[PDB]
Design a binder for this molecule. Structure first.
Ligand SMILES: CC(C)(CO)[C@@H](O)C(=O)NCCC(=O)NCCS
Ligand SMILES: CC(C)(CO)[C@@H](O)C(=O)NCCC(=O)NCCS
Ligand SMILES: CC(C)(CO)[C@@H](O)C(=O)NCCC(=O)NCCS
Ligand SMILES: CC(C)(CO)[C@@H](O)C(=O)NCCC(=O)NCCS
Ligand SMILES: CC(C)(CO)[C@@H](O)C(=O)NCCC(=O)NCCS
Ligand SMILES: CC(C)(CO)[C@@H](O)C(=O)NCCC(=O)NCCS
Lengths: 152, 152, 152, 152, 152, 152
């Protein structure tokens, strides 16, 4: 049977780091479900995310009204969560989340990949602040998300 | 003379991990004062914690108006602060605090215990995320505190 | 495609922590190969591990002349390497090895699992040091590897 | 490159640990510009900092309205950013900012000085919490900043 | 439990950091045993540490052939292991040990103290390197260990 | 103080990480000394490194017999030591080294630069093992050093 993974996240905004991880998990799982956990509408956001990922046949996007990620995985038939780790802070944060999740849904595995070195310093919080100051972060964004962004 | 330790905290809520550290430090010190720094009434928390720590004869609960923890310890004749460490982010946060405490009250020693591995991942803000979303976190709460909790 | 994973190690000795990781990874992958990179003769090492891992159909064991882990993975048709992370130290060490592996073989992906918490303090140098002083670590080794080690 | 450094920060308030980093980095660069990004009016903040740094003739203060730090460094002609690291959390944090700044302005180098161990536990939020409760942290502040502190 | 604490170590040499830890835990325990696990002879070693520790009435020195710490605890009748933590590397190291000891002897508690800031950088191995090149590390050693040391 | 830095190391072999640091520090100091502490004759190693660095007019190579890094600096008139940081581990190790050197020679300032992200996973123990086993690590070596490694 299939191995399906939920990639949860808020994707505000989606990054090349995000896509990179999406790309690589697409190679490892039969399928990958990107759960966007809800300025930019939930008709909008899914759009851009679907556009950015169209190249991979076994990926799809989903607006999850906010709720236990393991609930939402259980519903879609996901036995795997997939997450990236970029630095120690990130490791300890995800490790906590993964331990809670194993408590709530022990039959779900969290699986990790390391961020690719070009994207390891990138976090939405740092990104937004730079956007807000109008630095050029175009190299870190899927271009559709980029084109989309500059009506701000 | 008695060696008295103050265990500061807001116990919002108190976890089995807290209890474990209290149980462990009641073996270490002559007595342990649970300083609840201020959901429910200042009366009610006291009650609950007292209930949960009832089995430990040398442990008592004192609601504290917000002040310097070291001033609060000075007041009670506690020459020791007892803290847990659960992970590296925890270590660095507590270490800062102890050093500033050592600067403020050089006579008071902060002592540390490490979290028991079943609880190392449990923080109060994560516990609260799970509760918000309806997750079963009962194995992490003192039975009285869980019962007293369903009621809101 | 098809998803084949190399789990490299020295397994000196093989713990329940190793096993946990094998079992978890036996559910992610079409198949998982255990690379014993070379006390006891390789026959026994191979035998013990096979014996201890005899419940999982899609797991096999392979002795490896030590050599680059990425080459030995090419030979097996493994596109994946599977690793545990048990703490920060483990994290920084596997990260380095994973990037180098990626530079040596950008088509093998390294995949991570966090250690399950009864085993996250276990490492074979700690084990071996405890074993050398007569300490009881029977709970930490698979029964057969244990039974076998008492015989030597 | 000409040796011109921007030392950015909020200095709310300026500590001795700040003053220490300025003194050392004024031995390294031709000129050091203290970048104060906006309690007390920026007007008072300026006076106060130039009061504390008065003995170092190659140091000077500027009030910057928040804008990208690199952009402030360009308008000033500085090719060096100077930062302090006090612990691991701070390392990973400054590292992200430096990688991002290298992106926005790769001609600008970020340079690091390790916190002098008497001020390593000292951060702003901490100091202020202590001040909020009347703790004596006078040792951590340059006398001129203490004297100006008392009025509320 | 009786407030009897084992402070195990190789003490070669014993530094002012060790002594600082001993002094601080002599404020806490009724008995602090320095379990000295065996350059100079046992005798000389015993004599020097006894001499360094002479001002604390509840401290005694005991030589011990290398063995599991928790067996040496059992035999001496200590209920506590005391250890210091100087940085993150020390934190993860001590943590694994403490976890394994709890498994060996769950009735023995490990208690932790943070290193005092001025000795946080001193490890016995960095210190041997520096002595081995003739640097002046006399401030880091108890006056008497230092004399005894020139001589030999 | 005069902008004379020492860059101490064993350079076995020398990497592009090394070269990057040198290039960057060459922009910041008036003179950078490569301090080579002693497969190759020192004389060979000297010409190799000189050849790698030939393009920076303020850089120079000096062989030193093993000794306290700060004595070597003082001998050569360097007021600054320049080091790199690649990860948390390196950060904690450098930091102990810097504090000790500061105790030993408080007039000498240690200055840090963060490793560039292509080279941040590269350590000399890691390359050696890879060279041992025959892997193409040529994008991590300056060519002249690499060509020379075809020896035996
Ligand atoms: C958005 C995400 C994935 C980032 O860490 C995480 O915050 C998440 O799961 N949000 C939805 C709520 C949930 O399930 N919490 C359970 C915590 S054990
Ligand atoms: C911050 C907290 C909740 C847990 O670490 C606890 O330390 C706390 O609020 N204490 C009361 C305020 C105080 O004494 N702050 C100065 C500490 S140096
Ligand atoms: C699996 C490992 C790395 C221990 O973590 C170790 O078992 C290993 O690889 N041995 C073969 C040598 C190798 O391939 N080195 C290059 C790694 S970049
Ligand atoms: C004040 C300071 C230095 C503390 O970290 C930092 O917050 C800072 O840079 N503020 C200016 C805004 C900026 O340039 N942000 C993007 C950095 S990638
Ligand atoms: C070597 C020493 C004294 C610190 O310099 C201490 O760390 C130590 O534990 N020594 C060996 C005894 C032992 O029981 N090891 C297994 C621990 S689970
Ligand atoms: C080459 C180098 C710098 C890499 O860490 C390291 O090997 C080094 O320090 N060598 C010289 C010996 C020294 O000075 N030791 C004590 C410093 S407190």
């Amino acid at each position: 049977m299939r191995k399906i993974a939920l990639f949860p996240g808020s994707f505000d905004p989606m990054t090349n780091g995000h896509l990179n991880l999406i790309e690589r998990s697409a190679k490892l799982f039969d399928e990958v479900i990107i759960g966007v956990f809800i300025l930019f509408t939930p008709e909008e956001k899914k759009y851009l995310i679907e556009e950015a990922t169209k190249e991979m046949p076994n990926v799809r996007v989903i607006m999850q009204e906010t709720q236990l990620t393991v609930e939402s995985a259980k519903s879609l038939g996901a036995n795997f969560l997939i997450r990236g780790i970029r630095n120690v802070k990130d490791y300890e944060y995800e490790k906590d989340i993964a331990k809670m999740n194993q408590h709530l849904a022990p039959e779900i595995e969290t699986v990790f990949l390391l961020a690719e070195e070009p994207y390891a310093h990138v976090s939405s919080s740092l990104l937004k602040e730079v956007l807000r100051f109008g630095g050029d972060v175009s190299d870190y964004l899927p271009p559709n998300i980029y084109h989309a962004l500059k009506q701000k």
